[PDB]
Design a protein around this ligand. Structure first.
Ligand SMILES: OC[C@H]1O[C@@H](O[C@H]2[C@H](O)[C@@H](O)[C@H](O)O[C@@H]2CO)[C@H](O)[C@@H](O)[C@@H]1O
Length: 627
């Protein structure tokens, strides 16, 4: 009704206008309307569980502002139908909780893969499996696979059929230095139809022999975002007296939350702090870090001879979600059906808040995270390494070039969730954590005199936090630096969103931080004034990194020869473009070619689905909180 709720409706209409091309023919959202883009997905009409989580979120807010919950319902409907592997996709049998997987090391460079399986390395026990099967009556893992080839652009199809849309694929498998430019896109369902003699398996894992198999990878941050969104849909619908419409969808989030607990465990269920790959495996919750790790994953042979499940030893603050955790732990509508689900989430909420505090720099920005597997090989931490419940501090968990915490974006995404949690609960630790972070945000955001703005784009880090012992020390030797600035609109909106929930919280619990409200309102106003276009909002960005289309060598072992579904030959020396020759059909290909041949950085105005969502949600958030 107000200026800001109307802003949401306008952009919402742009997003849902079928001619704008945010969705495919099945109503699956793409990563972006534009196809020529490479950053985490390597093609614009792939999609992520991230995009799906933002879709649920957008429609939850639509439900608040309209009272119409059909959009939220179909969002979840599409999510379950396509993004969660069906019973046919994950026919899991012969799982052994006492031996959940077999160990393989992680290695610093892609040329060190395939990683050899090490059959003598002890793995711990999985204490979730039996409870979950007993609770749900099924072996189906209720979590989103992270990456989808929406319109079968790569050509793997569904379950190796080579035709079907909504195709499950994966890329990242070769360690901390395998950038988006250096992957080999491969099917989640492996039947040896493509790639080499053993499909794509022996690029990644070295074994004595290879079996046809399926495997999926969950991105815990996305599943938690979907739960977070559903929490708000739950309270908003309850307020309108419409809880019952969306009741079985609140249950979807509860079940997803029940399975998301796999993200809380060490990769191979090794005890926290073990620092020895040959050490005995954990006997249960001694291998739980209780944080939202980089992934969980699960696989199984096509015949059903065996199956496996892994968590992840690596944790990034950018993944955490105290709002989702609180909801699953405490809200009786949201509590998982398993005996221990809610209790585990209560543990996670506490551990997550401690993690944020432990990582808070001298300035206020949040440092990267921690690992329970040094170098991904359970090695001994160097002397003087700062630790958190036996886990070693890492400035850049999981990825090193470029570092996973050199991206400012995680600051906004993750602290938005803390801000929501604080707004809801008044948690003193969350409040103190936010106050210092907001103080830092105020000192780094540029509100220019001419009406423009700039937010941090790249960050750099030095030092370490103090080792964690339950109390924040100030971490005087942990430092952030802003390396450069940009106008990332999705992140700008997320930052505004975070500042708004914090501001509303301080009004509710302490001294109203008007400045935080005003910084957020300005960001949203200036953005609205400057960046509206035909399909939503976009700001120009140069992508000098796109020379890697042409220049980036993809590592392939000597003598290993395979083929992509379109016929592209995979061998030593191939470039990014050589295994993706269909990119040459892209409407923007001449533009990229012209820029590259001329030694110029190509420029784009992107409409990323999540970015448009963050913008719509942030504006509506002002209306909901300060309207
Ligand atoms: O990997 C996190 C996040 O990145 C998003 O792309 C970033 C990109 O990593 C950064 O280098 C560039 O400057 O800006 C964009 C911000 O949108 C990507 O859109 C997400 O899917 C991904 O989860």
């Amino acid at each position: 009704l107000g200026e800001y709720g109307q802003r949401f409706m306008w952009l919402w209409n742009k997003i849902h206008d079928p001619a704008n091309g945010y969705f495919n023919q099945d109503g699956i959202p793409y990563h972006s309307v534009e196809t020529l883009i490479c950053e985490a997905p390597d093609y614009g009409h792939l999609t992520t569980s991230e995009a799906f989580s933002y879709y649920v979120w957008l429609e939850a807010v639509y439900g608040k502002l309209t009272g119409d919950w059909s959009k939220f319902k179909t969002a979840w409907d599409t999510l379950e139908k396509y993004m969660i592997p069906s019973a046919e996709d994950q026919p899991m049998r012969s799982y052994d909780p006492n031996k959940p997987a077999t160990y393989a090391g992680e290695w610093e460079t892609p040329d060190k893969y395939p990683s050899p399986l090490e059959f003598n390395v002890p793995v711990g026990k999985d204490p979730l499996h039996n409870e979950l099967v007993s609770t749900y009556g099924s072996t189906l893992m209720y979590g989103m696979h992270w990456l989808m080839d929406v319109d079968n652009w790569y050509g793997y199809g569904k379950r190796g059929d080579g035709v079907s849309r909504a195709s499950f694929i994966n890329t990242f498998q070769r360690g901390p230095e395998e950038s988006v430019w250096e992957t080999v896109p491969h099917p989640s369902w492996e039947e040896f139809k493509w790639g080499g003699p053993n499909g794509f398996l022996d690029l990644f894992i070295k074994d004595q022999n290879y079996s046809k198999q399926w495997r999926y990878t969950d991105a815990p941050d996305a599943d938690a975002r979907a739960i977070q969104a559903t929490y708000w849909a739950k309270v908003w619908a309850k307020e309108q007296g419409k809880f019952n419409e969306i009741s079985s969808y609140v249950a979807k989030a509860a079940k997803m939350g029940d399975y998301l607990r796999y993200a809380m465990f060490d990769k191979y269920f090794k005890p926290l702090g073990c620092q020895d790959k040959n050490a005995a495996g954990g006997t249960g919750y001694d291998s739980a870090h209780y944080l939202l790790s980089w992934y969980y994953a699960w696989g199984g042979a096509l015949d059903g001879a065996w199956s496996w499940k892994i968590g992840s030893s690596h944790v990034h603050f950018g993944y955490q979600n105290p709002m989702a955790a609180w909801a699953l732990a405490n809200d009786s509508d949201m509590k998982p059906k398993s005996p221990n689900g809610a209790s585990d989430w209560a543990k996670s909420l506490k551990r997550q808040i401690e993690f944020y505090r432990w990582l808070q720099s001298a300035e206020g920005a949040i440092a990267g995270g921690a690992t329970n597997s040094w170098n991904g090989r359970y090695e001994k931490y160097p002397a003087g390494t700062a630790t958190f419940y036996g886990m070693a501090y890492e400035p850049n968990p999981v990825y090193h070039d470029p570092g996973s915490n050199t991206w400012f974006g995680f600051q906004a995404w993750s602290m938005q969730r803390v801000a929501e949690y604080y707004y809801v609960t008044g948690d003193k630790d969350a409040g103190a954590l936010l106050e210092k972070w907001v103080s830092w945000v105020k000192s780094v955001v540029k509100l220019n005199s001419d009406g423009t703005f700039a937010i941090p784009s790249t960050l750099d880090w030095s030092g370490q936090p103090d080792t964690w012992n339950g109390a924040y020390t100030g971490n005087s030797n942990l430092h952030v630096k802003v390396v450069d600035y940009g106008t990332d609109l999705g992140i700008t909106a997320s930052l505004a969103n975070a500042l708004l929930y914090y501001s509303a919280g301080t009004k509710k619990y302490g001294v109203f931080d008007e400045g935080a409200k005003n910084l957020a309102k300005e960001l949203l106003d200036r953005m609205w004034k400057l960046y509206r276009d035909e399909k939503g909002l976009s700001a120009p960005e140069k992508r000098a990194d796109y020379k890697r289309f042409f220049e980036q060598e993809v590592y392939i072992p000597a003598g290993w020869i395979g083929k992509m579904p379109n016929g592209d030959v995979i061998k030593s020396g191939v470039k990014f473009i050589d295994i993706r020759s269909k990119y040459k059909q892209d409407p923007d290909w001449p533009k990229l070619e012209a820029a590259y041949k001329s030694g110029q950085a190509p420029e784009f105005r992107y409409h990323r689905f999540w970015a448009q969502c963050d913008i719509a949600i942030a504006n509506a958030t002002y209306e909901i909180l300060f309207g």
